[PDB]
Symmetry: D2
Subunit: 102 residues, 4 copies
């Protein structure tokens, strides 16, 4: 009876006693989604890690994700320099290092 032109989800989640903002929106042929804490963030494949490094962010990039669950179970593909300084490296499962983004 209707057409959905655009969809967005904004959720406040708590992990290990820390609060994070999960966002998901249609963007292109793939959706855009990220999880942001007070210290850093994790984002899907649309994230340009060169930009994260340029501005000194604590950031991680994951790929092939469509949901919050997928992100938490996904392995970090790229970690920013500031993220590596706090122990986050490519290969880590996001759920295991998300605490460092809060």
């Amino acid at each position: 009876n209707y057409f959905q032109g655009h969809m967005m989800q904004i959720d406040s989640i708590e992990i290990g006693g820390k609060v994070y903002q999960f966002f998901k929106s249609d963007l292109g042929n793939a959706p855009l989604l990220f999880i942001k804490g007070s210290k850093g963030y994790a984002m899907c494949g649309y994230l340009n890690m060169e930009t994260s490094n340029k501005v000194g962010d604590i950031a991680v990039r994951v790929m092939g994700v469509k949901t919050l669950d997928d992100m938490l179970s996904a392995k970090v593909v790229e970690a920013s320099q500031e993220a590596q300084k706090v122990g986050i490296n490519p290969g880590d499962v996001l759920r295991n290092v998300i605490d460092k983004l809060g």
Copy 2:
């Protein structure tokens, strides 16, 4: 693995060639949801119709809804004075008069 403290959904939908904004968020023991067009809006039971009338809105109030589908199939319980002026009355199925809110 996580706790959802708050959830929000924002969707842009098209009906009869008109664009509307559907919003749903946790609020209390019942969720808050509304559909807004360029001319007026429809909202769940949390809407105070006295306020809508006070400020001259074209507004309709529906009850017992939790989703967009529920709202569109719900019957108008209260219609603002400006809404009644354009033909909307209690009893009308929202889907049948939503065009007047765009």
Copy 3:
């Protein structure tokens, strides 16, 4: 160069060590805005207090507000039964009792 058909603001704020979700959106001739905590919420004049009481919410209604600052400095006009049980009463300045909504 463009026309703003609809505007929405979603902010995560911290007060007294507690996290709250502030939301503001165009709705009718007056905007819709609320502040929600884990236990209850405060909303502008569009809130139907009868509904809040019906579903057992801890809720407060304020009037004549357009911004977060206005809400925090506004006096509670109506307090739900559950809100009154925890000490919130009409006349209280929201900022002084917001802690009870988290």
Copy 4:
């Protein structure tokens, strides 16, 4: 009296009779912002153009932007392959080609 941990703005704007979704959110040391139409999107420096090309999006990347106005007046730094196919090229002012994203 309060601390803003996270801020987000979601606006529905109309340009040349077409509807677009403007989004802005805190992310890292730079904000995240994009404008999305029914056919494609424009995003700030955080956009990974390699990803846009990988999935076949009609996308443009602009830099040094913080507001909707900045984006519309900004020059396209990178254009996806599908975007170039419809005439969009690096150097174009977004406002002058946004119609092709709707």
